[model samples]
Every structure is written in structure tokens, then in C-alpha cells.
Target: KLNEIVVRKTKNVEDHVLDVIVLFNQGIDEVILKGTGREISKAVDVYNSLKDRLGDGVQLVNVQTGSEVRDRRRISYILLRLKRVY
Candidate 1:
């Protein structure tokens, strides 16, 4: 299975970026960044940081977005699938 990171607003964006890089260093070829509500923007920021740091070494495999109802409130979410390339 691929590694997954649930981005949280309380965490630093750079911290998440480092985690992904570390995972790749550990031979993880694929990773998923998931975020919901306001944190969705943070997820994108982390991806952008990774892009700047990793350049062409990392590629975006897929992107998914949707919404679900919880406690009668609609919550939107996003998923960014990334893969490491040579």
C-alpha cells in the first residue's frame, strides 16, 4: 500500500513537506496527501514546496476532490497522489 499523509492545519507546511521527502528517501515511491476543509489549501502548499524542492524527481500522479456531509454540514476534501521518479 502507498503511504498517506493527512494534512492538518495545526502543523507546519514545511514539516509535511519534509515528511514526504523523508518517505521518498526511505524507498517510498508513492504518497498521498489528503486534506479537508480549510486545510485543503495547506495540502496544496506542501505539494508546491515539494515541487520546488524535488523538481522533476517527483510527479503528481493524480488529484481527487469531493465533498461529504458530516453532522449535517458539507465538508470538501482533496487528495493529491504523488510519485517519485528517477
Candidate 2:
């Protein structure tokens, strides 16, 4: 397990970016950005927003994707591993 935040569709991009920065500032080494299905796109945007704002002070550590069964259908999920640069 890692320090993580579950992104919701209701949240705006700036909120996500601030959460990521605050998490890192709190001394967590990594922040796992997790989202499901269509929301996965939101996760990517958050990652990009942080990376762009941080300007090379952040690095992607990993990316995990998979699908789960839900109501007889498949739902996709993604986990983005991010680390702060020294």
C-alpha cells in the first residue's frame, strides 16, 4: 500500500493538484492517483497538471491498469504511481 487519494468526478483539476502537492509536502514519498473507468481520464489530467506545475520536480514511478467486473459489465481502473523529486 501507498499514500493514496481517490479522485471523484465532482472535483476540479486544481483541487487534485493541490492535494498532490500537500501530500508530498506532508513528507509522503509517493502519491498513488487512483480512478475508475471514464474517471481514469481525470486521473491522467491530474497527473499531468501536477507534473506540469511541478516542472520536473515530480517523476512518474509506475502505472497500473486493470478491469473489474461490475453488474455483469467490465469497469476499467488505473493507478498512477508518482514521486516527488529532491
Candidate 3:
């Protein structure tokens, strides 16, 4: 069996002031790359860079995503889950 491989880690994130729910009024193409620590900030920078250079061709989802529960301060492993898209 084969699994999905990330083509490039160089592809960074872009930030949205609001969540996807809020952007419903507008039509756009975006992606979400969620992470911790300066994650939000990094998203913003990447977004701005792509926007200025690439123009209005893509978007950054920056979904209001998180785990089912709060993570521990000293955790040995991490667990995550994602819902299917309609």
C-alpha cells in the first residue's frame, strides 16, 4: 500500500483574520496548515507572501481547529482526529 506524501514542506501557511465560517460571504481557494507556537504568526507571513506574489489565486483556511481535549504539559504522545468534508 501507498500513503500520501507531502510534496514540499517549503509550502508555508497564510493567515486569515477570521475562520472559514466567517468567509462564507466570499468565494476563495484556501488551505489550512495548523500548528502550535508562532503557528498562527507563521501562517500570516506565508499568506501575505503568497498573496503579494501569487495574486488572488489561492487562500489559507486557518480553520478553528483543535483537539477534543486539552493537551498535557508533559505528554509522551499526541493524538489527533479530523472530520470528513462533505
Cα lDDT listed for each candidate? 0.92, 0.88, 0.35
lDDT of 1 by residue, 15-59 (tens): 999988888888989999999999999999999999999899999
Which runs of model 3 end up more than 4 angstroms from their true locations?
Answer: 1-31, 65-71, 74-86
Error of 1 at 23 (Å): 0.8
Q: Summarize candidate 3's per-residue lDDT along 31-80 as a digit string, tens digits.
A: 34344434544544544555564454444333353343345553121111
Which candidate number maximizes lDDT? 1
Residue 16 displacement (Å), model 1: 0.3
Off by over 4 Å in 1: none
Candidate 1 global TM-score = 0.92
lDDT of 2 by residue, 1-86 (tens): 45888888999888998988887888987889999977899999999999888877999999999998889999899999898888
Q: Each candidate's TM vs. the true structure?
A: 0.92, 0.88, 0.36
TM-score winner: 1
Question: For candidate 2, what is the total of clashing residue pairs?
Answer: 0
Higher-TM-score candidate of 2 and 3: 2
Model 2 regions more than 4 Å off: none
Residue 46: error of model 1 in Å?
Answer: 0.4
What are the clashing pairs of model 2? none
